[PDB]
Amino acid sequence: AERGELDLTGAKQNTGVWLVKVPKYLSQQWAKASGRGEVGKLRIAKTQGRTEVSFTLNEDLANEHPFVLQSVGGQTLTVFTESSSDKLSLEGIVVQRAECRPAASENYMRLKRLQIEESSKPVRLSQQLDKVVT
Amino acid sequence: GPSSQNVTEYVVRVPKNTTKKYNIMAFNAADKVNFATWNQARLERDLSNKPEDQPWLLRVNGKSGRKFKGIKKGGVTENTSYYIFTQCPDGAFEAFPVHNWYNFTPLARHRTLTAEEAEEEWERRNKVLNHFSIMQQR
Amino acid sequence: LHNTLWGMVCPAETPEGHAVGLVKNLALMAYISVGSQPSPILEFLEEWSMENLEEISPAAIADATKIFVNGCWVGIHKDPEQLMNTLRKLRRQMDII
Amino acid sequence: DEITPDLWQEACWIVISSYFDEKGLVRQQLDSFDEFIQMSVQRIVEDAPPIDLQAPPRYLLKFEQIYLSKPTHWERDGAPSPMMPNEARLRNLTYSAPLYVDITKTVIKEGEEQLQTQHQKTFIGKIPIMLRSTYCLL
Amino acid sequence: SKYAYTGECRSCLETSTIWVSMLARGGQGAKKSAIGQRIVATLPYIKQEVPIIIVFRALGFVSDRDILEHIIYDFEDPEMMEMVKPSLDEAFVIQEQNVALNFIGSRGAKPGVTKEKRIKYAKEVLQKEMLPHVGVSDFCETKKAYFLGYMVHRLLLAALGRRELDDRDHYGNKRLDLAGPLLAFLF
Amino acid sequence: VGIRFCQECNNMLYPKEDKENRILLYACRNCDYQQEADNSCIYVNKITHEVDELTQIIADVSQDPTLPRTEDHPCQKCGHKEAVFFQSHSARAEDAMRLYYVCTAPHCGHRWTE
Amino acid sequence: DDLNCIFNDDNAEKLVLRIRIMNSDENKMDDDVFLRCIES
Numbered sequence A: 001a002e003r004g005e006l007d008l009t010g011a012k013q014n015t016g017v018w019l020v021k022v023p024k025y026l027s028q029q030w031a032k033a034s035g036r037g038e039v040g041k042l043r044i045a046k047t048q049g050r051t052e053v054s055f056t057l058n059e060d061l062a063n064e065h066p067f068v069l070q071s072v073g074g075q076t077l078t079v080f081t082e083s084s085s086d087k088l089s090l091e092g093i094v095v096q097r098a099e100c101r102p103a104a105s106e107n108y109m110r111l112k113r114l115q116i117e118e119s120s121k122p123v124r125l126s127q128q129l130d131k132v133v134t
Numbered sequence B: 001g002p003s004s005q006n007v008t009e010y011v012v013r014v015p016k017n018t019t020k021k022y023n024i025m026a027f028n029a030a031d032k033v034n035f036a037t038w039n040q041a042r043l044e045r046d047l048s049n050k051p052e053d054q055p056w057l058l059r060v061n062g063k064s065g066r067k068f069k070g071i072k073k074g075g076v077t078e079n080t081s082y083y084i085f086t087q088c089p090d091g092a093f094e095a096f097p098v099h100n101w102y103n104f105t106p107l108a109r110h111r112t113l114t115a116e117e118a119e120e121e122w123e124r125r126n127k128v129l130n131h132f133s134i135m136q137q138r
Numbered sequence C: 001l002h003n004t005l006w007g008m009v010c011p012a013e014t015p016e017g018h019a020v021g022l023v024k025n026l027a028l029m030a031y032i033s034v035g036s037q038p039s040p041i042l043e044f045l046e047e048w049s050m051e052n053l054e055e056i057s058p059a060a061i062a063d064a065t066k067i068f069v070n071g072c073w074v075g076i077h078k079d080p081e082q083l084m085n086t087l088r089k090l091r092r093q094m095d096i097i
Numbered sequence D: 001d002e003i004t005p006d007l008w009q010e011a012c013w014i015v016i017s018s019y020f021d022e023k024g025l026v027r028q029q030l031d032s033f034d035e036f037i038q039m040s041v042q043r044i045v046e047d048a049p050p051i052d053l054q055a056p057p058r059y060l061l062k063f064e065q066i067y068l069s070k071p072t073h074w075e076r077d078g079a080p081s082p083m084m085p086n087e088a089r090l091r092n093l094t095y096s097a098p099l100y101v102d103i104t105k106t107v108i109k110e111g112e113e114q115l116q117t118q119h120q121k122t123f124i125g126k127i128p129i130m131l132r133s134t135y136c137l138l
Numbered sequence E: 001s002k003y004a005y006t007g008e009c010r011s012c013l014e015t016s017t018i019w020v021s022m023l024a025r026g027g028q029g030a031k032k033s034a035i036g037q038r039i040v041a042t043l044p045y046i047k048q049e050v051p052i053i054i055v056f057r058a059l060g061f062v063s064d065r066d067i068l069e070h071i072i073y074d075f076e077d078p079e080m081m082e083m084v085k086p087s088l089d090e091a092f093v094i095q096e097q098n099v100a101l102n103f104i105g106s107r108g109a110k111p112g113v114t115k116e117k118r119i120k121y122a123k124e125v126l127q128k129e130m131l132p133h134v135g136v137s138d139f140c141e142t143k144k145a146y147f148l149g150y151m152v153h154r155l156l157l158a159a160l161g162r163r164e165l166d167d168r169d170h171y172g173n174k175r176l177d178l179a180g181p182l183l184a185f186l187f
Numbered sequence F: 001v002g003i004r005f006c007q008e009c010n011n012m013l014y015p016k017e018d019k020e021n022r023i024l025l026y027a028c029r030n031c032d033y034q035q036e037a038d039n040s041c042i043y044v045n046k047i048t049h050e051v052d053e054l055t056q057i058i059a060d061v062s063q064d065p066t067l068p069r070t071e072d073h074p075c076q077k078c079g080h081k082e083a084v085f086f087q088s089h090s091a092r093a094e095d096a097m098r099l100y101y102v103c104t105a106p107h108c109g110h111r112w113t114e
Numbered sequence G: 001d002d003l004n005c006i007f008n009d010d011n012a013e014k015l016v017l018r019i020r021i022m023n024s025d026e027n028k029m030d031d032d033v034f035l036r037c038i039e040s
Ligand SMILES: [Zn+2]
Pocket: F006, F008, F009, F010, F011, F012, F028, F029, F030, F031
């Protein structure tokens, strides 16, 4: 029992967590939801020799996101926490890694272009003065 | 059986503001870390600078065990976001947004060569023979 | 005269005297690229399946393809042919790149 | 359908006729000066650190958007007039345009009176204009 | 000269030259060529040639497994291992990061008074002059390590005969300063 | 034939012999970790450089639209008639100008020589 | 005579030698580093 001690009960329980990469518009929609209670549904389907992971956006949040699994054993990933009371703890170990991709193929680039217009807003260029200053 | 066609649904949720911050730290693949020997641990801000913009120092089981140094991930979270999914008895996944990412490297505890005697050692730039006769004097 | 000066620089145009081959001038079809910030290409590649160089496992960057943007190493990618097809397609459509 | 081998000797020459009608023979010079004036100048100004002062009161000067006007000439009486390129050649003048910057001057008097003055477009010099660029009279 | 292969990566940002390189076989016997061909780096504002392993230890990587991972990607082929081990044999004097930074700072033109100055000076010159394009902010350290590892990997590949030697007269390796960048530099 | 890393501080392991039991053993620079046999080969080195060049050839060379394509020599593994042939031309000299054929079928990175 | 060798008949493919070190220098340069230095 000390300030610098990290709680290691999560590692002793062998709790397995998932780390997933998502694109920025999904994060923006989740931030706009402001934790109402639900942002979407996570779907998993296992066949006789293959698996299929996807995420479906909430219909209210909108007004398909297939997932791709990847190799994990190249590194060992675990998650710890820091509290306001300075009580460090360990949540668990990452056992599976995935990434999120949009199902939109051609129209999605349009949104990318709009984000370009959202990202080219603060960059600023010189102007021409018709009249010299007075 | 049921495991061949297991179809289950998990509710996801993200909190807005919370009391405790969340971070990610990683070990090396071949470091061979074991958490069962971590009877006592310490994680404190290093005094080599002399606070939040400083590296961490981690120590396991006091001076007897191994110790690590922690550095911040260089990639800024401007276009990147990482969340942690934890199992709960209620079942609703609670997405924890990341605050910072950390990385720890092992540091052994032994007799360590100092720079002042390394200045004397440097005369044996290429004349040095019997390399394991250096640490015997140390 | 070097082999890579094909349509880049004129093979005939050269001053006489002490500056033979040091001074040369452009061919008729040679537009010198003026410059662009690599941020749209970098965030575009981050959208696709680039593992970040700092995030990637050590023993996983031998079987993959290193990506270089403006000479700075930014990560790896496991499917280079599809990446080249997508990059060439967007370059021909000149909408993002 | 497709270009037959008979029509190719006209087709490719129409293609490069369109190229030379759009771009021109001197395009690397003009586009380089364009991407020097439109960008880089203000990127250089903004990338420069804001100069800091001390004495105690603290003055901080921060640079901002870079204006550039059409090339002008000021005669003996001080009359600004647009200057012809031929006027520049005949009178042995320098074709140049005056460059303007907005500077924000933030005051600190250790009493929470941070009331910055948005000092407007101030004259700092002249850049020699490359002829027939977009920031030229022609 | 004595420098068999050179790994120039003249670097800038929106310049500083690094001259990582490799000694030839000029000496013989146990006196110089007892180990093999060493690999050494020149650095921009220090005035002498520190070995590349000492630089990598100054980056903050004590373990040599991570070092040879950065240098060599596939551990199956031993050729790069047996070419890179002599500079590891010239790297047992320094084992930890602060001694490496002290040695590098003391190797400069104007060394500091004590550790508080030499460590800070070496950290600064390693911070915002070592390869400015890959990283200039303080939290840019392992990208520098990976880029230098790729650099030494290129040097070893050209040493043992896979990568062809680059040529200056190839215009793929050459840029043209027009009025734009030149007036930008002056401005 | 190769070197390994100690599992205590991840450093080099040079081989030597001890003065007590007469067997080869690896050691680190700061360890008590001694290794064992089955790697009794220290400095293998092919001076004749007769190494096989059919190992460093990447299977992706099929997708390079500059190398010549032939159809006279079919693939030995998958039986595809078309193939891609090229020369080595590394930094080595006095090298034989053989053709290292690579099958051009997808999901078959077979390479051979003749 | 500090580098005695055992030569092989030419019938075999190897044609190898078996240079060792003897009691002439065994009864600061260590072993396996002196042998590699004389190999160089
Ligand atoms: Zn060790």
